[PDB]
Amino acid sequence: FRIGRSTELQNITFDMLKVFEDHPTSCMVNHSTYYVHENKNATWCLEVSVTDVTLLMAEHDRQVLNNLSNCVHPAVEHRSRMVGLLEWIFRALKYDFNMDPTPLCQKQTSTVNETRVQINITEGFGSHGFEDTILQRLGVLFGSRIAFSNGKKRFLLIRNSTWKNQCEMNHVNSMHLMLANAGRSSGS
Amino acid sequence: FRIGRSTELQNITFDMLKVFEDHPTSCMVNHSTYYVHENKNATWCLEVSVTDVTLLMAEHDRQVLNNLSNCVHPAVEHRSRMVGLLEWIFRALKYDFNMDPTPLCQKQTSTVNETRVQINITEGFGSHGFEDTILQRLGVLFGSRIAFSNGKKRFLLIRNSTWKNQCEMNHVNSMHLMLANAGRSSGS
Amino acid sequence: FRIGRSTELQNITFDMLKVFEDHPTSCMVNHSTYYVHENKNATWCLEVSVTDVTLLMAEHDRQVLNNLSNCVHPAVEHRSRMVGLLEWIFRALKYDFNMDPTPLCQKQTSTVNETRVQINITEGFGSHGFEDTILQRLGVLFGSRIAFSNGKKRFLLIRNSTWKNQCEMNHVNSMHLMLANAGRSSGS
Amino acid sequence: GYCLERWMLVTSDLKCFGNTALAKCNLDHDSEFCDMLKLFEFNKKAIEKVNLLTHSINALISDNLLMKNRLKELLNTPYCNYTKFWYVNHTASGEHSLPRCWLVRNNSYLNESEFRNDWIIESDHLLSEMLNKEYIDRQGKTPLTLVDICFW
Amino acid sequence: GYCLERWMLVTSDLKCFGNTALAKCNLDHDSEFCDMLKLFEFNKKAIEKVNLLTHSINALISDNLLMKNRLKELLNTPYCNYTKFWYVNHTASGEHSLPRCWLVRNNSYLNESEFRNDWIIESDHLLSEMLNKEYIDRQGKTPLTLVDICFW
Amino acid sequence: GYCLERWMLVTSDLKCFGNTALAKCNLDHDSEFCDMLKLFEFNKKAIEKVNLLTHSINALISDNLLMKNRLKELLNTPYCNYTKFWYVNHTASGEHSLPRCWLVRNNSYLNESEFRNDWIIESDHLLSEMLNKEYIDRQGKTPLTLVDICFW
């Protein structure tokens, strides 16, 4: 691009792969579905979804009360990394376990082979504006416009899954995730 | 105002109403009595006071243990907004429910039509300097000189009341309140 | 020092004693042993050590669950200051009592005259990277290179002791300690 | 430059600040006026529905400057309460300084004499700036080679 | 000046930016390019084992600038997504401006005309800068007393 | 300029730093010396009873600069330990640069040669600054119109 007879408009594009290969990243499939990935070579991931379907019940499932680690089965080989990444996500949400609604996770004898963590974001369950806080935090973390949309039941659900390259990693999302988790060790 | 033969001193005064109409604000009646207003048109408010009178007792009243929302009666129409504003206040105090003294709130069968939250700031009840921390936080939040004054019983009491234009709103107080509550949704 | 025929290299050394006489400070004996001191004239202190032998057991000792102040005997004259300094240390470590492993402190009927607080940093007890997080936080706080060293049992132990001038005062360590504890009252 | 809306101020008049004075906002971190301008600009662009003020309040309002002013207020020291700002205006030319906070003591605005030394030098500086931009403006257009030719 | 390794960029070419342009990084707080340079320098000096990126991510990346760009993205406003940066280069001399972020709308890079005023005037500044450093360079070497003697 | 108290230093001598050198503190964010000056000023004005140092420690001490220096210390890289600061002083005139931190390696102060390039060029800048303020001072007083008349 030639601005004038002695001036040219030039550009450079960065490659942020080696900076963020070994750190947690995230990406958006659509405005309701997000994926968090421990590092590039991890064969598993955690998807975060805004749902209108009640998947866990207080009468059948476990309350997360300072025991989030119990929500992952002891036989999972990446159990420690899974619990870590769950904590990374909870810090990224600015979640306050003292005042925010108590999350639910699946019963210990669940037949389904995935870890569910359910936060009730239905209006009136938490304080006024708690659901808007969660949706706007999702927009900050993943670039979601779900907060900018039109009182039924909603839930923020984090479930584990196998990594199938569902979405391409976003290094801006990586910077948001790491900034919300300053001081927590990462990178191998 | 004239400085020299070719220059003048002049000023502008800002109007901060439209910026802070829809957000929580606060006001100082005197150095011991404070009001937090959820927004300009709200007919209720939360009074925060430094008292020497024991109003709630551990033997008769409930202690706040991850259930602050239970301290507001379910029949209150603005219950969700009141619980939210209480959380805004606790978050503006930099309160740590893990290490700070457990707050008390009124019993379920209380005859008085007030939601009362009591924090014991008597010397020796918490760690050394906890009461000074609370009073200096009150000074930062509301402009209080109570910390800069002359070991009896003291309490920080947050009760609910009807808005009666007890003060005039302060946008510096609003700025402090919002800065302590960054990311929490507000404004309607 | 003479840089040239008309210039010189000059230096000034600061004396930060009077700035930090009345505030908590910390020292490194070696890469595993650190001491936190309330102020210059305090006759007690708290040492923080990375140890390889368990001192407290879940079967015999007390879990720290919103009751850290119970870990100091009521008869201690500096009990309130000791509990405060323990909270200052826990804030300096960026400890999250909701998601981090529950600390242990000694039983009520303990024969030893020490207040022990034990955090299990053995690999697998917490989430992945928790021990590295703690060791790197120790490096940030005291200048320790223990994180930069070569899966046996490991613990972070805070015990109380008498100040015997174990180190020299370090004002960089004081600055880190105060930055992690912004807003908490100190200085007498 | 940037023109303040009528609802922003209380004087019921149009106040436009030139870009020359407002260019100092980016470098300065102790200017409460620039924080107020950022807040007003964010609110204006939001008005013209989800309120995002809590997400950007850190980026618009400096917490350290607000803390410093509050601590000055608690110690009965002159402080900024983010309401009134003074600036020096060259009436003949229209050039003006970046507005500075009008300090407050005992719930009363500081009198003009009590910060006279503040608005004297500023005025002087303004004049000096008006005598320093002219040299830079000419130097921007004419290269050094042309001046060298005139010497010989 | 400082230059970027082959793995840093995607153009498979060597890119050295002079210290004159990079000197504006310390004063500016709205430059995403300087934040990217700080990240890349930290990563490079770490590569040449404990990763300390989470300890210094605040020091390298401005949370306020990232938050502002994210909020612009959420409002369907042009924003920086920290990938492509444009700069004005004086080809004959090699002097160049500090690179600025190439904005994005609708998941598409902003077209050159859509921010023409950003790089027209910027280009002008470059030329003016190249005509202002010459005066300062001469003024740095020759004292004012020598000029006074020439007058008399 | 601002002059340090006897108890602030360990040399048992009076050290006054001019306002010209200290004016760079506001723009700079990597100067540990300016952070030390802010701490000392806050302490002095507090001494001349509630201590408010924990409320303003963030405003006086940059956590990012401290974290960067600590991380350099942990990696066995030269770092600032906030104790000794060096500056270049023009003995004949008394003008001086803003003091910069004397780095430390292996619990030992860095030798003068190991950062010679830091204080060679710095010294040069001082002289250049002493030859650049004179031009600006004259330009501040005399307008451009007077110079134009002399040309014709």
Ligand SMILES: *[C@@H]1O[C@H](CO)[C@@H](O[C@@H]2O[C@H](CO)[C@@H](O[C@@H]3O[C@H](CO[C@H]4O[C@H](CO)[C@@H](O)[C@H](O)[C@@H]4O)[C@@H](O)[C@H](O[C@H]4O[C@H](CO)[C@@H](O)[C@H](O)[C@@H]4O)[C@@H]3O)[C@H](O)[C@H]2NC(C)=O)[C@H](O)[C@H]1NC(C)=O
């Ligand atoms: C994290 O940790 C929390 C606690 O800190 C766990 O929550 C507890 O989970 C246990 C085990 O499932 C629950 O115990 C069961 O509760 C029921 C009775 O509890 C009464 O009291 C609680 C007060 O805590 C009330 O909420 C509840 O309504 C009841 O009034 C029964 O369903 C169960 O009875 C079973 O055991 C008894 C004897 O042991 C048998 O006779 C019964 O037939 C039956 O088998 C059982 O006692 C406990 O209630 C939960 N507490 C709370 C507060 O919710 C979380 O599960 C844990 N999370 C993870 C992920 O580990």
Ligand SMILES: *[C@@H]1O[C@H](CO)[C@@H](O[C@@H]2O[C@H](CO)[C@@H](O[C@@H]3O[C@H](CO[C@H]4O[C@H](CO)[C@@H](O)[C@H](O)[C@@H]4O)[C@@H](O)[C@H](O[C@H]4O[C@H](CO)[C@@H](O)[C@H](O)[C@@H]4O)[C@@H]3O)[C@H](O)[C@H]2NC(C)=O)[C@H](O)[C@H]1NC(C)=O
């Ligand atoms: C997402 O998260 C979920 C939930 O946390 C994970 O699902 C768990 O996966 C583990 C393995 O990683 C499962 O554990 C395995 O289950 C099998 C046996 O289960 C039966 O166990 C007894 C047998 O009668 C009964 O209760 C019942 O029939 C159960 O179905 C076996 O495959 C494994 O046992 C074998 O290996 C272990 C360890 O090597 C040995 O001790 C055993 O002897 C045996 O050789 C193992 O126990 C676990 O059940 C799953 N949890 C749930 C809740 O279903 C997902 O793996 C995870 N996904 C990703 C991608 O991360």
Ligand SMILES: *[C@@H]1O[C@H](CO)[C@@H](O[C@@H]2O[C@H](CO)[C@@H](O[C@@H]3O[C@H](CO[C@H]4O[C@H](CO)[C@@H](O)[C@H](O)[C@@H]4O)[C@@H](O)[C@H](O[C@H]4O[C@H](CO)[C@@H](O)[C@H](O)[C@@H]4O)[C@@H]3O)[C@H](O)[C@H]2NC(C)=O)[C@H](O)[C@H]1NC(C)=O
């Ligand atoms: C937030 O949540 C907390 C708990 O998480 C609530 O605090 C509990 O409140 C309940 C209901 O008032 C209390 O239960 C009552 O406690 C007494 C006996 O409790 C023993 O154990 C507790 C340990 O938890 C000790 O503190 C206490 O000293 C006792 O040793 C009795 O007063 C009550 O007995 C009543 O019920 C029984 C049968 O149900 C009857 O026989 C009796 O006659 C009587 O009616 C009752 O059990 C409980 O103790 C509280 N726990 C704690 C830890 O304080 C908060 O109230 C809640 N806050 C809000 C705002 O909702």
Ligand SMILES: *[C@@H]1O[C@H](CO)[C@@H](O[C@@H]2O[C@H](CO)[C@@H](O[C@@H]3O[C@H](CO[C@H]4O[C@H](CO)[C@@H](O)[C@H](O)[C@@H]4O)[C@@H](O)[C@H](O[C@H]4O[C@H](CO)[C@@H](O)[C@H](O)[C@@H]4O)[C@@H]3O)[C@H](O)[C@H]2NC(C)=O)[C@H](O)[C@H]1NC(C)=O
């Ligand atoms: C500050 O906070 C306090 C405490 O949280 C609030 O006070 C509560 O106010 C609510 C209403 O907002 C009160 O609830 C109402 O009480 C009345 C009935 O109370 C009696 O209930 C039975 C009847 O025998 C007995 O236990 C006893 O006699 C009680 O006195 C009625 O006015 C209301 O009932 C009517 O409305 C509801 C809902 O519409 C219907 O379900 C009922 O059938 C009926 O039509 C209602 O229940 C509550 O009691 C108060 N709490 C306390 C602790 O006293 C303040 O309102 C709040 N103030 C502000 C300004 O925010």
Ligand SMILES: *[C@@H]1O[C@H](CO)[C@@H](O[C@@H]2O[C@H](CO)[C@@H](O[C@@H]3O[C@H](CO[C@H]4O[C@H](CO)[C@@H](O)[C@H](O)[C@@H]4O)[C@@H](O)[C@H](O[C@H]4O[C@H](CO)[C@@H](O)[C@H](O)[C@@H]4O)[C@@H]3O)[C@H](O)[C@H]2NC(C)=O)[C@H](O)[C@H]1NC(C)=O
């Ligand atoms: C901070 O607060 C926590 C609780 O909030 C305290 O932890 C409790 O400590 C008490 C003792 O101080 C423990 O009580 C003892 O526990 C055993 C039985 O507990 C059952 O249930 C708990 C669930 O809470 C399980 O962990 C446990 O395995 C058991 O299934 C027994 O050892 C004791 O019995 C004693 O009393 C009974 C009657 O009172 C007698 O018959 C017995 O002979 C014996 O004397 C006792 O009940 C309690 O379990 C602890 N809770 C938890 C969750 O760990 C911390 O100690 C406290 N910390 C500080 C520093 O104060």
Ligand SMILES: *[C@@H]1O[C@H](CO)[C@@H](O[C@@H]2O[C@H](CO)[C@@H](O[C@@H]3O[C@H](CO[C@H]4O[C@H](CO)[C@@H](O)[C@H](O)[C@@H]4O)[C@@H](O)[C@H](O[C@H]4O[C@H](CO)[C@@H](O)[C@H](O)[C@@H]4O)[C@@H]3O)[C@H](O)[C@H]2NC(C)=O)[C@H](O)[C@H]1NC(C)=O
């Ligand atoms: C580090 O932290 C530890 C643990 O918190 C502290 O050790 C405690 O120190 C206190 C004193 O500060 C000890 O309390 C004293 O113990 C003695 C009596 O203990 C016996 O008590 C009965 C008597 O039969 C039995 O249980 C048993 O035999 C005990 O050994 C006495 O010296 C004291 O009592 C006297 O003073 C009190 C108050 O003045 C009076 O009420 C009494 O009547 C009597 O006159 C006192 O009770 C406590 O036991 C220690 N804790 C532990 C766990 O051992 C360290 O002091 C602390 N160190 C530093 C440097 O800070």
Ligand SMILES: *[C@@H]1O[C@H](CO)[C@@H](O[C@@H]2O[C@H](CO)[C@@H](O[C@@H]3O[C@H](CO)[C@@H](O)[C@H](O)[C@@H]3O)[C@H](O)[C@H]2NC(C)=O)[C@H](O)[C@H]1NC(C)=O
């Ligand atoms: C998540 O939170 C929501 C919001 O509180 C919960 O849904 C609500 O559940 C309550 C009962 O717990 C429902 O109240 C009932 O409604 C009807 C009359 O409207 C009737 O069955 C009863 O008299 C009672 O009042 C309430 O309607 C319902 N709200 C909505 C919007 O559906 C939900 O249970 C929570 N889910 C989990 C998994 O935690």
Ligand SMILES: *[C@@H]1O[C@H](CO)[C@@H](O[C@@H]2O[C@H](CO)[C@@H](O[C@@H]3O[C@H](CO)[C@@H](O)[C@H](O)[C@@H]3O)[C@H](O)[C@H]2NC(C)=O)[C@H](O)[C@H]1NC(C)=O
């Ligand atoms: C708020 O905290 C204060 C401070 O701890 C509590 O007051 C204190 O209560 C204790 C008992 O719980 C009092 O101790 C008693 O004092 C006398 C002798 O001095 C005697 O009755 C007993 O032997 C016992 O030692 C203590 O004096 C008292 N302190 C003060 C300053 O009054 C208070 O109970 C707490 N209130 C609430 C509502 O939580």
Ligand SMILES: *[C@@H]1O[C@H](CO)[C@@H](O[C@@H]2O[C@H](CO)[C@@H](O[C@@H]3O[C@H](CO)[C@@H](O)[C@H](O)[C@@H]3O)[C@H](O)[C@H]2NC(C)=O)[C@H](O)[C@H]1NC(C)=O
């Ligand atoms: C601190 O945390 C560590 C790490 O989890 C705990 O040590 C671990 O303790 C478990 C039992 O609770 C040990 O598992 C046992 O190991 C052998 C076979 O390897 C056998 O005895 C049992 O079948 C069982 O699997 C585990 O080996 C052990 N890990 C290490 C590295 O020693 C420790 O108990 C915790 N300590 C405290 C005081 O909390």
Ligand SMILES: *[C@@H]1O[C@H](CO)[C@@H](O[C@@H]2O[C@H](CO)[C@@H](O)[C@H](O)[C@H]2NC(C)=O)[C@H](O)[C@H]1NC(C)=O
């Ligand atoms: C900043 O301080 C000034 C006074 O120094 C305040 O202006 C006064 O406001 C009250 C209402 O609270 C009026 O009754 C007075 O007439 C005003 N005085 C003057 C001299 O104008 C102003 O409100 C303060 N602003 C804040 C945010 O505290």
Ligand SMILES: *[C@@H]1O[C@H](CO)[C@@H](O[C@@H]2O[C@H](CO)[C@@H](O)[C@H](O)[C@H]2NC(C)=O)[C@H](O)[C@H]1NC(C)=O
């Ligand atoms: C920044 O935005 C640009 C487009 O404006 C993105 O570049 C696109 O990347 C996708 C893959 O995600 C490619 O398929 C497209 O071909 C690219 N488009 C162009 C025009 O180059 C870029 O990935 C974005 N970066 C981030 C971090 O979000």
Ligand SMILES: *[C@@H]1O[C@H](CO)[C@@H](O[C@@H]2O[C@H](CO)[C@@H](O)[C@H](O)[C@H]2NC(C)=O)[C@H](O)[C@H]1NC(C)=O
């Ligand atoms: C900064 O580092 C210097 C050395 O590089 C420290 O000065 C030494 O202090 C010890 C006491 O700890 C004295 O015994 C030495 O004689 C000093 N050495 C020199 C060369 O002066 C200084 O204490 C350090 N400051 C901090 C805050 O760590």
Ligand SMILES: *[C@@H]1O[C@H](CO)[C@@H](O)[C@H](O)[C@H]1NC(C)=O
């Ligand atoms: C402040 O000024 C007011 C108004 O004159 C006066 O009443 C008061 O005593 C002064 N001092 C203090 C400390 O408030």
Ligand SMILES: *[C@@H]1O[C@H](CO)[C@@H](O)[C@H](O)[C@H]1NC(C)=O
């Ligand atoms: C953005 O541009 C795309 C591509 O042309 C178009 O499909 C879309 O409608 C535009 N608007 C929005 C709000 O996404």
Ligand SMILES: *[C@@H]1O[C@H](CO)[C@@H](O)[C@H](O)[C@H]1NC(C)=O
């Ligand atoms: C972008 O602008 C150029 C001219 O600079 C024009 O040729 C081109 O068509 C434009 N692209 C689009 C997609 O409008």
Ligand SMILES: *[C@@H]1O[C@H](CO)[C@@H](O)[C@H](O)[C@H]1NC(C)=O
């Ligand atoms: C640092 O220098 C000291 C003093 O000479 C020396 O003993 C030590 O080996 C050096 N290296 C390290 C890594 O400490």
